PDB file of C-alpha atoms in Angstrom:
ATOM      1  CA  UNK V   1      18.979   5.170  -4.753  1.00  0.00           C
ATOM      2  CA  UNK V   2      16.240   5.036  -2.371  1.00  0.00           C
ATOM      3  CA  UNK V   3      13.466   6.623  -4.005  1.00  0.00           C
ATOM      4  CA  UNK V   4      14.083   2.822  -7.316  1.00  0.00           C
ATOM      5  CA  UNK V   5      11.264   1.016  -7.525  1.00  0.00           C
ATOM      6  CA  UNK V   6      10.425  -2.210  -9.831  1.00  0.00           C
ATOM      7  CA  UNK V   7       7.209  -2.786 -11.267  1.00  0.00           C
ATOM      8  CA  UNK V   8       5.919  -5.843 -13.523  1.00  0.00           C
ATOM      9  CA  UNK V   9       3.143  -7.768 -14.023  1.00  0.00           C
ATOM     10  CA  UNK V  10       2.933 -11.447 -14.248  1.00  0.00           C
ATOM     11  CA  UNK V  11      -0.184 -13.639 -14.232  1.00  0.00           C
ATOM     12  CA  UNK V  12      -1.048 -17.193 -11.471  1.00  0.00           C
ATOM     13  CA  UNK V  13      -4.701 -19.447 -11.754  1.00  0.00           C
ATOM     14  CA  UNK V  14      -5.380 -17.251 -14.625  1.00  0.00           C
ATOM     15  CA  UNK V  15      -5.278 -13.927 -12.258  1.00  0.00           C
ATOM     16  CA  UNK V  16      -3.228 -10.590 -13.270  1.00  0.00           C
ATOM     17  CA  UNK V  17      -1.118  -9.906 -10.383  1.00  0.00           C
ATOM     18  CA  UNK V  18       0.973  -6.268 -10.375  1.00  0.00           C
ATOM     19  CA  UNK V  19       4.261  -6.612  -8.222  1.00  0.00           C
ATOM     20  CA  UNK V  20       5.891  -3.211  -6.653  1.00  0.00           C
ATOM     21  CA  UNK V  21       9.527  -3.702  -5.214  1.00  0.00           C
ATOM     22  CA  UNK V  22      11.540  -1.143  -3.302  1.00  0.00           C
ATOM     23  CA  UNK V  23      14.877  -2.330  -5.287  1.00  0.00           C
ATOM     24  CA  UNK V  24      17.047  -1.289  -2.235  1.00  0.00           C
ATOM     25  CA  UNK V  25      15.210  -2.686   0.162  1.00  0.00           C
ATOM     26  CA  UNK V  26      13.859  -5.679  -1.457  1.00  0.00           C
ATOM     27  CA  UNK V  27       9.558  -4.529   0.243  1.00  0.00           C
ATOM     28  CA  UNK V  28       7.182  -6.019  -2.473  1.00  0.00           C
ATOM     29  CA  UNK V  29       4.202  -4.827  -2.583  1.00  0.00           C
ATOM     30  CA  UNK V  30       1.182  -7.024  -4.839  1.00  0.00           C
ATOM     31  CA  UNK V  31      -2.002  -7.138  -5.622  1.00  0.00           C
ATOM     32  CA  UNK V  32      -4.961  -8.777  -7.812  1.00  0.00           C
ATOM     33  CA  UNK V  33      -5.919  -6.928 -10.807  1.00  0.00           C
ATOM     34  CA  UNK V  34      -9.321  -7.707 -13.180  1.00  0.00           C
ATOM     35  CA  UNK V  35      -7.655  -6.895 -16.055  1.00  0.00           C
ATOM     36  CA  UNK V  36      -4.444  -6.318 -17.362  1.00  0.00           C
ATOM     37  CA  UNK V  37      -5.324  -2.025 -18.606  1.00  0.00           C
ATOM     38  CA  UNK V  38      -3.382   0.707 -18.814  1.00  0.00           C
ATOM     39  CA  UNK V  39      -6.594   1.988 -16.266  1.00  0.00           C
ATOM     40  CA  UNK V  40      -5.493  -0.608 -14.008  1.00  0.00           C
ATOM     41  CA  UNK V  41      -1.314  -0.225 -14.008  1.00  0.00           C
ATOM     42  CA  UNK V  42      -2.368   3.771 -13.444  1.00  0.00           C
ATOM     43  CA  UNK V  43      -4.059   3.058 -10.053  1.00  0.00           C
ATOM     44  CA  UNK V  44      -1.626   1.109  -9.007  1.00  0.00           C
ATOM     45  CA  UNK V  45       0.395   3.288  -9.087  1.00  0.00           C
ATOM     46  CA  UNK V  46      -0.820   6.023  -7.718  1.00  0.00           C
ATOM     47  CA  UNK V  47      -1.662   3.822  -4.661  1.00  0.00           C
ATOM     48  CA  UNK V  48       1.707   2.877  -4.739  1.00  0.00           C
ATOM     49  CA  UNK V  49       3.003   6.477  -4.912  1.00  0.00           C
ATOM     50  CA  UNK V  50       1.078   8.185  -2.446  1.00  0.00           C
ATOM     51  CA  UNK V  51       2.232   5.272   0.473  1.00  0.00           C
ATOM     52  CA  UNK V  52       6.149   6.108  -0.480  1.00  0.00           C
ATOM     53  CA  UNK V  53       8.295   8.950  -1.758  1.00  0.00           C
ATOM     54  CA  UNK V  54       8.674   6.990  -5.098  1.00  0.00           C
ATOM     55  CA  UNK V  55      11.385   9.076  -7.819  1.00  0.00           C
ATOM     56  CA  UNK V  56      11.363   5.987 -10.157  1.00  0.00           C
ATOM     57  CA  UNK V  57       9.721   3.321 -11.469  1.00  0.00           C
ATOM     58  CA  UNK V  58      12.054   0.745 -13.685  1.00  0.00           C
ATOM     59  CA  UNK V  59       9.743  -2.036 -15.448  1.00  0.00           C
ATOM     60  CA  UNK V  60       9.328  -4.243 -17.424  1.00  0.00           C
ATOM     61  CA  UNK V  61       8.487  -3.028 -20.894  1.00  0.00           C
ATOM     62  CA  UNK V  62       4.926  -5.534 -20.811  1.00  0.00           C
ATOM     63  CA  UNK V  63       2.635  -3.745 -22.787  1.00  0.00           C
ATOM     64  CA  UNK V  64       0.529  -2.246 -19.903  1.00  0.00           C
ATOM     65  CA  UNK V  65       3.507   0.454 -18.569  1.00  0.00           C
ATOM     66  CA  UNK V  66       3.235   1.793 -22.068  1.00  0.00           C
ATOM     67  CA  UNK V  67      -0.688   2.720 -22.127  1.00  0.00           C
ATOM     68  CA  UNK V  68      -0.905   6.632 -22.456  1.00  0.00           C
ATOM     69  CA  UNK V  69      -2.596   6.237 -19.265  1.00  0.00           C
ATOM     70  CA  UNK V  70      -0.072   5.404 -17.679  1.00  0.00           C
ATOM     71  CA  UNK V  71       2.804   7.680 -18.865  1.00  0.00           C
ATOM     72  CA  UNK V  72       0.378  10.192 -17.360  1.00  0.00           C
ATOM     73  CA  UNK V  73      -0.064   8.876 -14.052  1.00  0.00           C
ATOM     74  CA  UNK V  74       4.151   9.073 -13.718  1.00  0.00           C
ATOM     75  CA  UNK V  75       3.464  12.871 -15.227  1.00  0.00           C
ATOM     76  CA  UNK V  76       1.045  13.476 -12.727  1.00  0.00           C
ATOM     77  CA  UNK V  77       3.266  12.422  -9.235  1.00  0.00           C
ATOM     78  CA  UNK V  78       7.009  13.366 -10.334  1.00  0.00           C
ATOM     79  CA  UNK V  79       8.229   9.411 -12.025  1.00  0.00           C
ATOM     80  CA  UNK V  80      10.802   8.860 -14.383  1.00  0.00           C
ATOM     81  CA  UNK V  81       9.292   5.915 -15.416  1.00  0.00           C
ATOM     82  CA  UNK V  82      12.506   3.985 -17.511  1.00  0.00           C
ATOM     83  CA  UNK V  83      10.979   0.440 -19.318  1.00  0.00           C
ATOM     84  CA  UNK V  84      13.191  -1.900 -19.817  1.00  0.00           C
ATOM     85  CA  UNK V  85      15.513  -1.898 -16.677  1.00  0.00           C
ATOM     86  CA  UNK V  86      16.338  -5.463 -15.651  1.00  0.00           C
ATOM     87  CA  UNK V  87      15.771  -6.052 -12.077  1.00  0.00           C
ATOM     88  CA  UNK V  88      18.885  -6.897 -10.335  1.00  0.00           C
ATOM     89  CA  UNK V  89      18.891  -5.619  -6.168  1.00  0.00           C
ATOM     90  CA  UNK V  90      22.881  -4.743  -5.612  1.00  0.00           C
ATOM     91  CA  UNK V  91      22.006  -5.134  -1.822  1.00  0.00           C
ATOM     92  CA  UNK V  92      22.726  -8.187   0.095  1.00  0.00           C
ATOM     93  CA  UNK V  93      19.770 -10.270   1.048  1.00  0.00           C
ATOM     94  CA  UNK V  94      17.313  -8.929  -1.807  1.00  0.00           C
ATOM     95  CA  UNK V  95      15.998 -11.980  -3.628  1.00  0.00           C
ATOM     96  CA  UNK V  96      16.360 -11.724  -7.681  1.00  0.00           C
ATOM     97  CA  UNK V  97      13.817 -13.606  -8.492  1.00  0.00           C
ATOM     98  CA  UNK V  98      10.475 -11.797  -6.772  1.00  0.00           C
ATOM     99  CA  UNK V  99       7.350 -13.735  -8.841  1.00  0.00           C
ATOM    100  CA  UNK V 100       9.096 -16.788  -8.420  1.00  0.00           C
ATOM    101  CA  UNK V 101       9.078 -16.351  -5.172  1.00  0.00           C
ATOM    102  CA  UNK V 102       6.336 -13.988  -3.983  1.00  0.00           C
ATOM    103  CA  UNK V 103       3.898 -17.361  -5.796  1.00  0.00           C
ATOM    104  CA  UNK V 104       5.697 -20.045  -3.636  1.00  0.00           C
ATOM    105  CA  UNK V 105       4.434 -17.838  -0.781  1.00  0.00           C
ATOM    106  CA  UNK V 106       1.386 -17.621  -2.711  1.00  0.00           C
ATOM    107  CA  UNK V 107       1.840 -21.860  -2.146  1.00  0.00           C
ATOM    108  CA  UNK V 108       2.253 -21.643   1.336  1.00  0.00           C
ATOM    109  CA  UNK V 109      -0.107 -20.344   2.088  1.00  0.00           C
ATOM    110  CA  UNK V 110      -3.481 -20.690  -0.711  1.00  0.00           C
ATOM    111  CA  UNK V 111      -4.847 -23.775   1.734  1.00  0.00           C
ATOM    112  CA  UNK V 112      -6.039 -21.177   4.086  1.00  0.00           C
ATOM    113  CA  UNK V 113      -7.998 -17.972   1.679  1.00  0.00           C
ATOM    114  CA  UNK V 114     -10.833 -18.652   0.108  1.00  0.00           C
ATOM    115  CA  UNK V 115      -9.918 -16.990  -3.506  1.00  0.00           C
ATOM    116  CA  UNK V 116      -6.147 -15.511  -4.750  1.00  0.00           C
ATOM    117  CA  UNK V 117      -6.605 -12.270  -4.177  1.00  0.00           C
ATOM    118  CA  UNK V 118      -6.092 -13.027  -0.549  1.00  0.00           C
ATOM    119  CA  UNK V 119      -3.443 -15.681  -0.700  1.00  0.00           C
ATOM    120  CA  UNK V 120      -1.640 -12.425  -2.086  1.00  0.00           C
ATOM    121  CA  UNK V 121      -2.581 -10.090   0.679  1.00  0.00           C
ATOM    122  CA  UNK V 122      -1.029 -13.177   3.191  1.00  0.00           C
ATOM    123  CA  UNK V 123       1.753 -14.192   1.106  1.00  0.00           C
ATOM    124  CA  UNK V 124       2.746  -9.594   1.021  1.00  0.00           C
ATOM    125  CA  UNK V 125       2.673  -9.802   4.449  1.00  0.00           C
ATOM    126  CA  UNK V 126       4.736 -12.786   5.069  1.00  0.00           C
ATOM    127  CA  UNK V 127       8.056 -11.771   2.443  1.00  0.00           C
ATOM    128  CA  UNK V 128       8.329  -8.832   3.951  1.00  0.00           C
ATOM    129  CA  UNK V 129       8.336 -10.220   7.805  1.00  0.00           C
ATOM    130  CA  UNK V 130      10.874 -12.702   7.203  1.00  0.00           C
ATOM    131  CA  UNK V 131      14.083 -12.165   8.458  1.00  0.00           C
ATOM    132  CA  UNK V 132      16.781 -11.853   6.109  1.00  0.00           C
ATOM    133  CA  UNK V 133      20.909 -12.475   7.634  1.00  0.00           C
ATOM    134  CA  UNK V 134      20.222 -14.873  10.382  1.00  0.00           C
ATOM    135  CA  UNK V 135      18.492 -14.479  13.888  1.00  0.00           C
ATOM    136  CA  UNK V 136      20.784 -11.204  14.009  1.00  0.00           C
ATOM    137  CA  UNK V 137      19.480  -9.637  10.475  1.00  0.00           C
ATOM    138  CA  UNK V 138      16.393  -7.644   9.525  1.00  0.00           C
ATOM    139  CA  UNK V 139      12.826  -8.617   7.009  1.00  0.00           C
ATOM    140  CA  UNK V 140      11.999  -6.156   3.927  1.00  0.00           C
ATOM    141  CA  UNK V 141       9.123  -3.858   5.542  1.00  0.00           C
ATOM    142  CA  UNK V 142      12.475  -3.135   8.700  1.00  0.00           C
ATOM    143  CA  UNK V 143      14.691  -2.271   6.109  1.00  0.00           C
ATOM    144  CA  UNK V 144      12.814  -0.278   3.586  1.00  0.00           C
ATOM    145  CA  UNK V 145      11.554   2.863   6.435  1.00  0.00           C
ATOM    146  CA  UNK V 146      14.675   2.496   7.869  1.00  0.00           C
ATOM    147  CA  UNK V 147      15.795   3.280   4.164  1.00  0.00           C
ATOM    148  CA  UNK V 148      13.449   5.854   3.362  1.00  0.00           C
ATOM    149  CA  UNK V 149      13.425   7.779   7.093  1.00  0.00           C
ATOM    150  CA  UNK V 150      14.965  11.208   6.711  1.00  0.00           C
ATOM    151  CA  UNK V 151      15.284  11.633   9.793  1.00  0.00           C
TER     152      UNK V 151
ATOM    153  CA  UNK X   1       1.524   4.800  19.851  1.00  0.00           C
ATOM    154  CA  UNK X   2       3.223   3.580  16.362  1.00  0.00           C
ATOM    155  CA  UNK X   3       0.984   0.222  15.758  1.00  0.00           C
ATOM    156  CA  UNK X   4      -2.660   2.343  16.563  1.00  0.00           C
ATOM    157  CA  UNK X   5      -4.601   3.216  13.303  1.00  0.00           C
ATOM    158  CA  UNK X   6      -7.858   3.906  13.146  1.00  0.00           C
ATOM    159  CA  UNK X   7     -10.887   2.807  10.549  1.00  0.00           C
ATOM    160  CA  UNK X   8     -14.188   4.371   8.970  1.00  0.00           C
ATOM    161  CA  UNK X   9     -15.930   4.613   5.765  1.00  0.00           C
ATOM    162  CA  UNK X  10     -17.105   7.561   4.652  1.00  0.00           C
ATOM    163  CA  UNK X  11     -19.463   8.138   1.237  1.00  0.00           C
ATOM    164  CA  UNK X  12     -19.238  10.923  -2.029  1.00  0.00           C
ATOM    165  CA  UNK X  13     -20.758  10.635  -5.035  1.00  0.00           C
ATOM    166  CA  UNK X  14     -22.973   7.588  -3.832  1.00  0.00           C
ATOM    167  CA  UNK X  15     -19.760   5.756  -3.599  1.00  0.00           C
ATOM    168  CA  UNK X  16     -17.648   4.563  -0.546  1.00  0.00           C
ATOM    169  CA  UNK X  17     -14.353   5.741   0.486  1.00  0.00           C
ATOM    170  CA  UNK X  18     -12.252   3.270   3.418  1.00  0.00           C
ATOM    171  CA  UNK X  19     -10.236   5.187   5.206  1.00  0.00           C
ATOM    172  CA  UNK X  20      -7.352   4.164   6.986  1.00  0.00           C
ATOM    173  CA  UNK X  21      -5.342   6.943   9.340  1.00  0.00           C
ATOM    174  CA  UNK X  22      -2.006   6.338  11.518  1.00  0.00           C
ATOM    175  CA  UNK X  23      -3.404   8.148  14.349  1.00  0.00           C
ATOM    176  CA  UNK X  24       0.328   9.282  15.445  1.00  0.00           C
ATOM    177  CA  UNK X  25       1.248  10.344  11.896  1.00  0.00           C
ATOM    178  CA  UNK X  26      -1.884  11.364   9.863  1.00  0.00           C
ATOM    179  CA  UNK X  27      -1.057   9.589   7.737  1.00  0.00           C
ATOM    180  CA  UNK X  28      -3.683   7.626   5.670  1.00  0.00           C
ATOM    181  CA  UNK X  29      -4.328   5.405   3.102  1.00  0.00           C
ATOM    182  CA  UNK X  30      -7.713   5.317   0.749  1.00  0.00           C
ATOM    183  CA  UNK X  31      -9.741   3.871  -1.546  1.00  0.00           C
ATOM    184  CA  UNK X  32     -13.595   3.552  -3.242  1.00  0.00           C
ATOM    185  CA  UNK X  33     -14.617   0.124  -1.695  1.00  0.00           C
ATOM    186  CA  UNK X  34     -17.877  -1.315  -4.412  1.00  0.00           C
ATOM    187  CA  UNK X  35     -20.085  -1.944  -1.156  1.00  0.00           C
ATOM    188  CA  UNK X  36     -19.196  -1.202   2.594  1.00  0.00           C
ATOM    189  CA  UNK X  37     -19.048  -4.731   3.279  1.00  0.00           C
ATOM    190  CA  UNK X  38     -16.779  -7.117   4.892  1.00  0.00           C
ATOM    191  CA  UNK X  39     -14.880  -8.289   2.873  1.00  0.00           C
ATOM    192  CA  UNK X  40     -13.331  -5.655   1.527  1.00  0.00           C
ATOM    193  CA  UNK X  41     -12.733  -4.541   5.069  1.00  0.00           C
ATOM    194  CA  UNK X  42     -10.979  -7.994   5.692  1.00  0.00           C
ATOM    195  CA  UNK X  43      -8.565  -6.745   2.897  1.00  0.00           C
ATOM    196  CA  UNK X  44      -7.811  -3.587   2.943  1.00  0.00           C
ATOM    197  CA  UNK X  45      -6.961  -4.458   6.517  1.00  0.00           C
ATOM    198  CA  UNK X  46      -3.879  -7.413   4.745  1.00  0.00           C
ATOM    199  CA  UNK X  47      -2.802  -5.101   2.757  1.00  0.00           C
ATOM    200  CA  UNK X  48      -2.487  -2.417   5.369  1.00  0.00           C
ATOM    201  CA  UNK X  49      -0.429  -4.982   8.192  1.00  0.00           C
ATOM    202  CA  UNK X  50       1.705  -6.170   4.718  1.00  0.00           C
ATOM    203  CA  UNK X  51       3.320  -2.820   4.885  1.00  0.00           C
ATOM    204  CA  UNK X  52       3.429  -1.106   7.955  1.00  0.00           C
ATOM    205  CA  UNK X  53       2.920  -2.728  12.390  1.00  0.00           C
ATOM    206  CA  UNK X  54      -0.964  -2.280  13.050  1.00  0.00           C
ATOM    207  CA  UNK X  55      -0.801  -3.258  16.317  1.00  0.00           C
ATOM    208  CA  UNK X  56      -3.973  -2.202  16.880  1.00  0.00           C
ATOM    209  CA  UNK X  57      -6.802  -0.373  14.936  1.00  0.00           C
ATOM    210  CA  UNK X  58      -9.926   1.558  16.728  1.00  0.00           C
ATOM    211  CA  UNK X  59     -13.305   1.315  14.113  1.00  0.00           C
ATOM    212  CA  UNK X  60     -17.426   2.206  14.818  1.00  0.00           C
ATOM    213  CA  UNK X  61     -18.083  -1.602  15.816  1.00  0.00           C
ATOM    214  CA  UNK X  62     -20.636  -2.042  11.987  1.00  0.00           C
ATOM    215  CA  UNK X  63     -21.441  -5.048  10.664  1.00  0.00           C
ATOM    216  CA  UNK X  64     -18.773  -4.512   7.909  1.00  0.00           C
ATOM    217  CA  UNK X  65     -15.593  -4.035  10.450  1.00  0.00           C
ATOM    218  CA  UNK X  66     -16.277  -7.168  12.687  1.00  0.00           C
ATOM    219  CA  UNK X  67     -17.619 -10.335  10.338  1.00  0.00           C
ATOM    220  CA  UNK X  68     -16.366 -13.597  10.266  1.00  0.00           C
ATOM    221  CA  UNK X  69     -13.862 -13.121   7.699  1.00  0.00           C
ATOM    222  CA  UNK X  70     -12.772 -10.051   9.053  1.00  0.00           C
ATOM    223  CA  UNK X  71     -11.839 -11.731  12.414  1.00  0.00           C
ATOM    224  CA  UNK X  72     -10.098 -14.010  10.559  1.00  0.00           C
ATOM    225  CA  UNK X  73      -7.789 -11.530   8.562  1.00  0.00           C
ATOM    226  CA  UNK X  74      -6.904  -9.843  11.463  1.00  0.00           C
ATOM    227  CA  UNK X  75      -6.108 -12.808  13.626  1.00  0.00           C
ATOM    228  CA  UNK X  76      -4.436 -14.249  11.339  1.00  0.00           C
ATOM    229  CA  UNK X  77      -2.707 -10.588  10.197  1.00  0.00           C
ATOM    230  CA  UNK X  78      -1.882 -10.134  14.647  1.00  0.00           C
ATOM    231  CA  UNK X  79      -4.206  -6.990  14.815  1.00  0.00           C
ATOM    232  CA  UNK X  80      -6.012  -6.818  17.968  1.00  0.00           C
ATOM    233  CA  UNK X  81      -9.787  -5.235  17.325  1.00  0.00           C
ATOM    234  CA  UNK X  82     -11.228  -2.434  19.516  1.00  0.00           C
ATOM    235  CA  UNK X  83     -14.116  -0.242  19.697  1.00  0.00           C
ATOM    236  CA  UNK X  84     -12.771   3.076  19.105  1.00  0.00           C
ATOM    237  CA  UNK X  85     -11.951  11.710  16.108  1.00  0.00           C
ATOM    238  CA  UNK X  86      -8.802  11.957  13.906  1.00  0.00           C
ATOM    239  CA  UNK X  87     -10.814   9.636  11.611  1.00  0.00           C
ATOM    240  CA  UNK X  88     -14.238  11.676  11.775  1.00  0.00           C
ATOM    241  CA  UNK X  89     -11.657  15.020  11.042  1.00  0.00           C
ATOM    242  CA  UNK X  90      -9.940  12.673   8.350  1.00  0.00           C
ATOM    243  CA  UNK X  91     -13.093  11.760   6.457  1.00  0.00           C
ATOM    244  CA  UNK X  92     -14.405  15.614   6.058  1.00  0.00           C
ATOM    245  CA  UNK X  93     -10.078  17.110   5.628  1.00  0.00           C
ATOM    246  CA  UNK X  94     -10.176  13.900   2.688  1.00  0.00           C
ATOM    247  CA  UNK X  95     -13.417  15.266   0.842  1.00  0.00           C
ATOM    248  CA  UNK X  96     -11.758  18.426   0.711  1.00  0.00           C
ATOM    249  CA  UNK X  97      -8.910  17.758  -1.013  1.00  0.00           C
ATOM    250  CA  UNK X  98     -10.927  15.306  -3.589  1.00  0.00           C
ATOM    251  CA  UNK X  99     -13.153  18.266  -4.355  1.00  0.00           C
ATOM    252  CA  UNK X 100      -9.752  20.127  -4.654  1.00  0.00           C
ATOM    253  CA  UNK X 101      -8.243  18.138  -7.394  1.00  0.00           C
ATOM    254  CA  UNK X 102     -11.725  16.386  -8.219  1.00  0.00           C
ATOM    255  CA  UNK X 103     -11.087  17.975 -11.855  1.00  0.00           C
ATOM    256  CA  UNK X 104      -7.967  17.048 -12.679  1.00  0.00           C
ATOM    257  CA  UNK X 105      -9.424  13.285 -13.368  1.00  0.00           C
ATOM    258  CA  UNK X 106     -12.491  11.172 -14.281  1.00  0.00           C
ATOM    259  CA  UNK X 107     -13.335   8.509 -12.323  1.00  0.00           C
ATOM    260  CA  UNK X 108     -13.324   9.192  -8.291  1.00  0.00           C
ATOM    261  CA  UNK X 109     -11.291   6.146  -7.308  1.00  0.00           C
ATOM    262  CA  UNK X 110      -8.909   7.907  -8.818  1.00  0.00           C
ATOM    263  CA  UNK X 111      -9.342  11.573  -7.287  1.00  0.00           C
ATOM    264  CA  UNK X 112      -9.444   9.750  -3.802  1.00  0.00           C
ATOM    265  CA  UNK X 113      -5.677   8.175  -4.740  1.00  0.00           C
ATOM    266  CA  UNK X 114      -4.519  11.981  -5.488  1.00  0.00           C
ATOM    267  CA  UNK X 115      -5.820  13.509  -2.460  1.00  0.00           C
ATOM    268  CA  UNK X 116      -3.776  10.380  -0.696  1.00  0.00           C
ATOM    269  CA  UNK X 117      -0.838  10.870  -2.487  1.00  0.00           C
ATOM    270  CA  UNK X 118      -1.327  15.483  -1.715  1.00  0.00           C
ATOM    271  CA  UNK X 119      -2.095  14.781   1.903  1.00  0.00           C
ATOM    272  CA  UNK X 120       0.142  12.105   2.387  1.00  0.00           C
ATOM    273  CA  UNK X 121       3.156  14.429   0.392  1.00  0.00           C
ATOM    274  CA  UNK X 122       2.623  17.582   1.515  1.00  0.00           C
ATOM    275  CA  UNK X 123       4.852  19.363   3.705  1.00  0.00           C
ATOM    276  CA  UNK X 124       3.704  20.896   6.654  1.00  0.00           C
ATOM    277  CA  UNK X 125       4.352  24.060   8.545  1.00  0.00           C
ATOM    278  CA  UNK X 126       7.498  26.327   6.822  1.00  0.00           C
ATOM    279  CA  UNK X 127      11.151  25.183   6.242  1.00  0.00           C
ATOM    280  CA  UNK X 128      11.930  22.134   9.092  1.00  0.00           C
ATOM    281  CA  UNK X 129       8.518  20.602   8.953  1.00  0.00           C
ATOM    282  CA  UNK X 130       7.709  17.019   8.197  1.00  0.00           C
ATOM    283  CA  UNK X 131       5.154  15.676   5.938  1.00  0.00           C
ATOM    284  CA  UNK X 132       2.776  13.032   7.251  1.00  0.00           C
ATOM    285  CA  UNK X 133       5.150  10.370   4.770  1.00  0.00           C
ATOM    286  CA  UNK X 134       7.555  11.197   6.485  1.00  0.00           C
ATOM    287  CA  UNK X 135       6.190  11.056   9.819  1.00  0.00           C
ATOM    288  CA  UNK X 136       5.144   7.815  10.059  1.00  0.00           C
ATOM    289  CA  UNK X 137       8.660   6.225   8.705  1.00  0.00           C
ATOM    290  CA  UNK X 138      10.411   7.780  11.091  1.00  0.00           C
ATOM    291  CA  UNK X 139       8.088   6.451  14.059  1.00  0.00           C
ATOM    292  CA  UNK X 140       8.137   3.479  13.051  1.00  0.00           C
ATOM    293  CA  UNK X 141      11.849   3.552  12.639  1.00  0.00           C
ATOM    294  CA  UNK X 142      12.819   5.808  15.604  1.00  0.00           C
ATOM    295  CA  UNK X 143      10.790   2.286  16.931  1.00  0.00           C
ATOM    296  CA  UNK X 144      13.332  -0.262  15.582  1.00  0.00           C
ATOM    297  CA  UNK X 145      15.513   0.967  16.809  1.00  0.00           C
TER     298      UNK X 145
END
């Protein structure tokens, strides 16, 4: 489905990073958050939901996703929350170990950023622009818009 | 025109909101930021450029839009900065929707995202219309084709 996203929370350098993956394309967004709280998790979800037509989230069942505040945000936004449904992209080319991918790219750009939060965004950018399937292929960023475009 | 955005700040409830408009579509992104600063602008632009193919940003050239960190982020992302009333009209529209939905969240920052959601997903017109979110994606997907 075009409306399905995988959400997880990971950590790096002792900081909290929320990650959203559009399962059909491999497109990601990610951000460092100050604390792993329901409110921060709800805010992130709400931002995501206003960008894209988000219908279903699969989560890692981390405690943050079990906050009432997250359920309220999903209810408001008309998102079906599905905790504990594993990430196992079926599309050819969609990377299966995404927190690992993201962290590998962060290491490739970290020395350009005074603070990790900036490095995370540079890494998201690189991930989304990477061409998959050879020189004739497409990036995740191209595939998400192709998939989600209605007309 | 698929790569052209306008970016400004607007003020509500003693807080700063940083607003971006994709001119061709009317799609918006916006967030409460803690202060009207160059570091916040650069961070927002890097996030924007990882999502959409941003080629040109037009701003009012306040200091928070022209710092050396904003330039470094724009250069890295491939964004051309220009000195460029679509965003002014959108500041007012965004504030109007925030007012209309304000009772559904305690914190302004939440209400701002609710307003962005409503603005981006509301179908314009009748049967046959599109939302702004659908327009931006159709424009970009068409441009890649």
